C-alpha cells in the first residue's frame, strides 16, 4: 500500500493544470497503494536532455513510470526513448504524439507502453471499415518502410481466410528511399483499376509519392486510395499529398482528450500497482543512476510486465498486448472534408464503427433499385 512513484513527460504547449489536478484527484478505493506524483515538463525533447533528466528522474525521486508527451509527431526519439528505457528497464508509456506511436517489437527488455491498437490491428479495423464501406474491390500499395511484409501477410491472410466476397487483386511494393526516374509509381502503378486503393508509406515519402498519385489522377470519382494513421500524421498539418477526402483511420485524437487518456495512463500504472500488491505484494527499488547501471544491473528481474498483462480501470481495459496492442482499444476513422480538413469517418472500437454517412460519401452512374423478394 505504499506511495507509487511515476513520472509524466510534457513537450509542447499544453494544459498541465487540470492534468496535475486530476493527478491528485484521480483515486480508487480499489487501489491498495497510493500514488507518488511529481509532474515533469521539458522544452528540449532530445534524450540527451530528455534521457538526461530522465536519468535524473530515476535519480531524484522514485518514479516507476514515464508518461511521454512530445511536441512533434516524429517518433524516432520515442523509439530511442524506449531504448534508454530498457537500458533503465523501467516502465514507461508514451502519452502523446509520436511517443504513443508504435514501433516494431523491441528487445525483450523493453517495457515501453502506448495507448492504442497495433498498427497491424489498426489495419485490421481498416479493412473492417472496408466492410463498413461495402466496397468489394480493393488493392494495396506501399513503399519499403518496415512492417511491409508484416502488413502484407496481415491483409492477405486477413481477407484471405474470410468467408465474405470482398474483392481484391494485387498489392504494389515500392522503395521510396530511392525513386523511379521513370515514375514506376505512376508508370507501373497506373495499372491498378481497383475501385478502392490502400495507401501505406511515410508521410514524407508520401509527399512525393502521393504527388505522383496526383500525377496519376487517382482521385477520380470512385477512384480513391485509403490510407494509414501515422502516414496521415497530424490532422492539423495538411499535406498536399493526401487527396481530397483522404480515407484513413487513427487512434482517437481530436475527440479524445490526450490529458484525459493520460489520467487513464497513470491510472493504468496504478493498476499494475493494484495487481502488484495483489500478487507480488512488493515493488522493486528505484533505479539509482544512469552511471549506476553497474550497481543496479543484477537488480533487474521483472514480473511487473508479467503482471502488466491484464490491465483495466474505470470501465476501460488498459491491458496492452504481448506486442503492446490495447486489449480493448479504440480508434477513429477520418477523412478530409470539403473544407480540405480531415473529418471523422468513424470510431473504431470493439471491432465496431459508428458511421454517420449511410454510405462512403461520394459526390464529385449510381442507380437505385428496389423490389420484393419473390423466388424465382
Amino acid at each position: 500500500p505504499p506511495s507509487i512513484g511515476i513520472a509524466v513527460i510534457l513537450v509542447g504547449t499544453s494544459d498541465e493544470v487540470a492534468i496535475k489536478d486530476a493527478h491528485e484527484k484521480d483515486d480508487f478505493h480499489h487501489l491498495s497503494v497510493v500514488p507518488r506524483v511529481e509532474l515533469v515538463a521539458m522544452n528540449e525533447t532530445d534524450p540527451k536532455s530528455i534521457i538526461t533528466r530522465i536519468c535524473d528522474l530515476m535519480s531524484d525521486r522514485k518514479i516507476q513510470g514515464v508518461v511521454f508527451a512530445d511536441d512533434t509527431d516524429q517518433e524516432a526519439i520515442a523509439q530511442i526513448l524506449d531504448f534508454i528505457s530498457a537500458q533503465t528497464l523501467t516502465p514507461i508509456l508514451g502519452i502523446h504524439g509520436g511517443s504513443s506511436m508504435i514501433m516494431a517489437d523491441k528487445d525483450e527488455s523493453s517495457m515501453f507502453f502506448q495507448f492504442g491498437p497495433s498498427i497491424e490491428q489498426q489495419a485490421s479495423v481498416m479493412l473492417n471499415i472496408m466492410e463498413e464501406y461495402d466496397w468489394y474491390i480493393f488493392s494495396i500499395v506501399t513503399t519499403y518502410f518496415p512492417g511491409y511484409q508484416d502488413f502484407v501477410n496481415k491483409i492477405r491472410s486477413t481477407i484471405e481466410n474470410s468467408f465474405v466476397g470482398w474483392e481484391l487483386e494485387e498489392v504494389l511494393l515500392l522503395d521510396m528511399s530511392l525513386d523511379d526516374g521513370d515514375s514506376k509509381i505512376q508508370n507501373q502503378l497506373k495499372k491498378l483499376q481497383s475501385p478502392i486503393i490502400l495507401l501505406y508509406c511515410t508521410k514524407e515519402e508520401a509527399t512525393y509519392i502521393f504527388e505522383v498519385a496526383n500525377s496519376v489522377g487517382l482521385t477520380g470519382y470512385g477512384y480513391t486510395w485509403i490510407v494509414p494513421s501515422l502516414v496521415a500524421g497530424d490532422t492539423d498539418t495538411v499535406p498536399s499529398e493526401f487527396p481530397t477526402g483522404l480515407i484513413s483511420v487513427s487512434y482517437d485524437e481530436w475527440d479524445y482528450g490526450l490529458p484525459a487518456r493520460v489520467r487513464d495512463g497513470i491510472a493504468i500504472i496504478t493498476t499494475a500497482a493494484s495487481d502488484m500488491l495483489s500478487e507480488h505484494s512488493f515493488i522493486p527499488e528505484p533505479k539509482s543512476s544512469c552511471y549506476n547501471t553497474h550497481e543496479k544491473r543484477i537488480y533487474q528481474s521483472n514480473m511487473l510486465n508479467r503482471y502488466l498483462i491484464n490491465v483495466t480501470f474505470e470501465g476501460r481495459d488498459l491491458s496492452f498486448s504481448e506486442d503492446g496492442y490495447q486489449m480493448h482499444p479504440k480508434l477513429v476513422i477520418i477523412l478530409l472534408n470539403k473544407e480540405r480538413k480531415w473529418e471523422r469517418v468513424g470510431k473504431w472500437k470493439d471491432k465496431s464503427l459508428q458511421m454517420k454517412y449511410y454510405v462512403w460519401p461520394r459526390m464529385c452512374d449510381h442507380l437505385s433499385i428496389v423490389t420484393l423478394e419473390e423466388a424465382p
Partner: protein, 371 residues
C-alpha cells in the same frame, strides 16, 4: 577541413594507432579541401553515459562520421537519433543488421548469420543431397535460420533440401527432442546453429546423444565452436571462419580505409549539409548524413587493409573468406578456406567424425516403415 572522427573501442592505445590511421588517411585521400581529425572515447560498460559521450564528443563536434567496435551501440541507435553517419566494426550479430532498429548501420564486417552462405559452400563440400538444421531458439537465431531457408530457398530456381529444423530455448536442459529427431533422422547431414552456451548444451547433448562418432555431421561456426565450447566440443569437428575474424587492429586499419573512402565520396558530395551541432532539443536531421549513407552505399572500394572485398545491399561486407578448420586430436586445426565462391582446401585431409576421414552416404533407408 579536418574531419572529426570518433571511434568506440576498449582502449585508447589502439585509439592512438587509430589516430595514426587518421594520418595515413589524411595522406591517402586528397587533403586540399579537407583533412582528418581523430578524437574519440572508448566503449564503457554502461551505455547511458556512453551515449552521453556520444552526443558530447560527436554531436557537439558535429562530425562527418564516427566509428564503433566491440546490446552494444544503443548510442549508435542514438546516431540514428541524428540519422548521422557512424561506423560499426566488430559486429557478427545481424541484430545490428536490423533495418528497423538500425536505419543505416555501415560496417565492413559480415554478421555471423552470413555463415549460412558458408554452410551452402559446405553443401558443395560434403556434397550431401540431404541436409538438416540444428538450431537453438532465439529471435536473432530464428532470423539467421530464415536466412538458412533462403540458402535452401535459393535452390528453388529450377539440392540438399534439409528435412527439418527445430528451436531450442536458451540453456535448455533436455535436448532429447533434438537428439530424438536425430535418431528419427535418416540422413547424417545436420546444420548446427548456436551461440556460446547454446553450443555448450549442444555438444554436451551430442555426447549424450552418443552420435559423436562418424555418421553424424553437425556443422557450425567458430562463433559457436570456439572458446570454452571447444572444451566439451564434439570429436573431429570441422568448420570455417571468416578471414581475420577476431582481429581488431586490422579492423581499425581497413576501417580507416573505407572511412577515407567515405572522405572522397563526401568530397564527391555537393551542397554540403553540415552535420547538426545542436543536439539537445534538435528536432531535425541534416539531409547529408543519410545521403552520406547512400554515398557509402554507392561507394564500393577497390580494396581495404583487408584487401579487395565486397559489400551487401544491407551494407554488410561480402566475398569474405571463411577459413576451413577442423578439430585434430581434440585440438582445432585450420583445414582450408572458402572465400568468394572459392573453397580452398588446405593440405590437411578432411577428417570425418569417426576415425576415418572418408565421406560415406549418410542418408540411409530405414527398413522399418512408419505408416
Amino acid at each position: 577541413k579536418i574531419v572529426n572522427i570518433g571511434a568506440v573501442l576498449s582502449t585508447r592505445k589502439h585509439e592512438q594507432m587509430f589516430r595514426e590511421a587518421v594520418n595515413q588517411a589524411n595522406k591517402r585521400h586528397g587533403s586540399w579541401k579537407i583533412q582528418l581529425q581523430a578524437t574519440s572515447v572508448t566503449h564503457k560498460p554502461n551505455a547511458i553515459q556512453m551515449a552521453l559521450s556520444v552526443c558530447e564528443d560527436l554531436i557537439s563536434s558535429q562530425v562527418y562520421a564516427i566509428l564503433v567496435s566491440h546490446t552494444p551501440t544503443p548510442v549508435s541507435y542514438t546516431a540514428g537519433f541524428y540519422r548521422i553517419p557512424v561506423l560499426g566494426l566488430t559486429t557478427r550479430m545481424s541484430i545490428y543488421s536490423d533495418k528497423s532498429i538500425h536505419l543505416s548501420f555501415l560496417r565492413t564486417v559480415p554478421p555471423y548469420s552470413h555463415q549460412s552462405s558458408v554452410w551452402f559452400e559446405m553443401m558443395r563440400v560434403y556434397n550431401w543431397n540431404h541436409i538438416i538444421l540444428l538450431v537453438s531458439d532465439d529471435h536473432e537465431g530464428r532470423a539467421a535460420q530464415k536466412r538458412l531457408e533462403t540458402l535452401l530457398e535459393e535452390r528453388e530456381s529450377k539440392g540438399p533440401k534439409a528435412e527439418k529444423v527445430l528451436q531450442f530455448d536458451p540453456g535448455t536442459k533436455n535436448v532429447t527432442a533434438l537428439l530424438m529427431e536425430a535418431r528419427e533422422l535418416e540422413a547424417r547431414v545436420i546444420i548446427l546453429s548456436a551461440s556460446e552456451d547454446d553450443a555448450a548444451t549442444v555438444y554436451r547433448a551430442a555426447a549424450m546423444l552418443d552420435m559423436t562418432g562418424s555418421g553424424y555431421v553437425w556443422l557450425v561456426g567458430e562463433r559457436e565452436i570456439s572458446g570454452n565450447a571447444l572444451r566439451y566440443a564434439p570429436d573431429g569437428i570441422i568448420g570455417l571462419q571468416l578471414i581475420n575474424g577476431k582481429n581488431e587492429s586490422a579492423h581499425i586499419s581497413d576501417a580507416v580505409g573505407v572511412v577515407a573512402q567515405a572522405v572522397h565520396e563526401l568530397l564527391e558530395k555537393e551542397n554540403i549539409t553540415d552535420p547538426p551541432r545542436g543536439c539537445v532539443g534538435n528536432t531535425n536531421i541534416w539531409k547529408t548524413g543519410p545521403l552520406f549513407k547512400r554515398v557509402l552505399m554507392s561507394s564500393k572500394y577497390a580494396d581495404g587493409v583487408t584487401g579487395r572485398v565486397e559489400f551487401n545491399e544491407d551494407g554488410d561486407r561480402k566475398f569474405a573468406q571463411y577459413s576451413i578448420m577442423n578439430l585434430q586430436n581434440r585440438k582445432l586445426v585450420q583445414v582450408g578456406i572458402y572465400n568468394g565462391t572459392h573453397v580452398i582446401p588446405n593440405d590437411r585431409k578432411i577428417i570425418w567424425p569417426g576415425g576415418e576421414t572418408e565421406k560415406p552416404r549418410g542418408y540411409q533407408m530405414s527398413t522399418r516403415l512408419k505408416i
